[PDB]
């Protein structure tokens, strides 16, 4: 139900984990670029971790497309879900994390009505 | 090719028989060598002794235990030269080295199996005639390998009962020939030779 798109090519599925966030607990994976003077990572010696740079950049044509081929859009209520009415083949809806259980079934409904894909159509579903 | 290759040690050059045996194990071909005590090494005896007393002196200083292990058995001196030609601290190399057996003499079952030879390792095709060379267990025996004469006695035992089988074989391959001769000239025979057989 998506638009046609080329094969979605990633170029790096591995996450970039900041040098040594495996070593010290105090070092958070959250990527950081070493400025040190001796750092084998900055100097790019063989066998060290790869660094983020512009060439890894996803293709413009498949950029932002989830696996299903829809650019995902955040929806807190029907009015937001309704901005997607004409784009059913472009965007899918994601229901926001805080929307009340009762207001989800409302949206889930209106969306099935409009043919708008919803990505997280389970959250807070009594079953 | 074969699920096991028994090589005959006698009269091959240690270096080259090693190099060939190695790659086979790194390539997955189980190999067992026999009669290593009859291996040859280029250069005369006395040089290869000093060459062994040079290995002999190297030992880890504070504990002569954890230092280089100097093996005096002909099968070992050969296993050495192999081991050095494998990457033997890798898992891949533990694999290799486990495919290979080495022995003095030709012990059981190997003795009832045909054994091959490595042409590129043969001393007779490889040395130029008149270059001196050493015989392993003679070297090994000077560096302390105790069992040379137990090998000798047991090989002099084997080769007798080997000749007795080869006798019986020969006589029977003669019967074979004589029936196969009366098979020549027949309808089959000339048909067969027509096709290469």
């Amino acid at each position: 139900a998506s638009l046609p798109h080329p094969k979605i090519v990633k170029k790096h599925t591995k996450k970039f984990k900041r040098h040594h966030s495996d070593r010290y607990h105090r070092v958070a994976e959250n990527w950081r670029k070493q400025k040190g003077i001796d750092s084998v990572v900055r100097r790019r010696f063989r066998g060290n971790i790869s660094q983020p740079k512009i060439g890894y950049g996803s293709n413009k044509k498949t950029k932002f497309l989830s696996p299903s081929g829809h650019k995902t859009f955040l929806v807190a209520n029907v009015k937001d879900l309704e901005t997607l009415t004409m784009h059913t083949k472009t965007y899918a809806a994601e229901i926001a994390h805080n929307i009340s259980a009762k207001n989800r079934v409302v949206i889930l409904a209106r969306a099935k009505a409009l043919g708008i894909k919803v990505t997280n159509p389970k959250g807070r579903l009594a079953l | 090719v074969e699920p096991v290759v028994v090589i005959d040690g006698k009269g091959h050059l240690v270096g080259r028989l090693a190099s060939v045996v190695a790659k086979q194990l790194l390539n997955g071909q189980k190999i067992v060598v026999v009669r290593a005590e009859e291996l040859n090494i280029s250069g005369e005896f006395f040089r290869n002794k000093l060459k062994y007393h040079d290995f002999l002196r190297k030992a880890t200083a504070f504990n002569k235990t954890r230092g280089p292990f100097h093996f005096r058995a002909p099968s070992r001196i050969f296993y050495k030269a192999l081991r050095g030609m494998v990457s033997h601290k890798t898992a891949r190399g533990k694999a290799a080295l486990e495919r290979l057996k080495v022995f003095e003499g030709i012990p059981p079952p190997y003795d009832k199996k045909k054994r091959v030879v490595v042409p590129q390792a043969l001393r007779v095709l490889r040395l130029k005639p008149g270059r001196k060379y050493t015989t392993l267990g003679k070297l090994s025996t000077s560096v302390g390998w105790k069992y040379e004469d137990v090998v000798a006695k047991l090989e002099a035992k084997r080769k007798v009962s080997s000749a007795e089988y080869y006798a019986k074989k020969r006589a029977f391959t003669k019967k074979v020939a004589s029936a196969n001769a009366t098979a020549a000239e027949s309808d089959v025979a000339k048909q067969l030779a027509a096709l290469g057989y």
Binding site: - | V1, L26, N27, G28, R92, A95, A96
Partner: protein
């Protein structure tokens, strides 16, 4: 009969490698009896399967297969380069492989 074999026996040697750097995307095969690059021109494009066994059942079998194809001759003694749908595990250096007779040009 006894013999049912439809392929030539072949061995998995290395990855393609320089001295210190390998390349799992490409493997090096020894093919039974193929002695020369000439000889190995016969086998290019011919399709390899590596057969291994498992403990779990999957599509109805405890046997599994990785498929590949000879790409090009490798050096002077008849080694040949192949490339596999998913690369070979390199536990498999010294392992048996199967080079089937097809695509046939005979």
């Amino acid at each position: 009969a006894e013999s049912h074999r439809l392929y030539v026996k072949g061995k998995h040697l290395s990855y393609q490698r320089s001295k210190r750097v390998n390349n799992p995307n490409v493997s090096l095969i020894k093919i039974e009896g193929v002695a020369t690059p000439q000889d190995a021109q016969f086998y290019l494009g011919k399709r390899i399967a590596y057969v291994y066994r498992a403990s779990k059942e999957v599509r109805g079998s405890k046997i599994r297969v990785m498929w590949g194809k000879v790409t090009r001759t490798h050096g002077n003694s008849g080694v040949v380069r192949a490339t596999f749908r998913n690369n070979l595990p390199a536990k498999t250096f010294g392992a048996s492989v199967r080079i089937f007779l097809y695509p046939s040009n005979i």
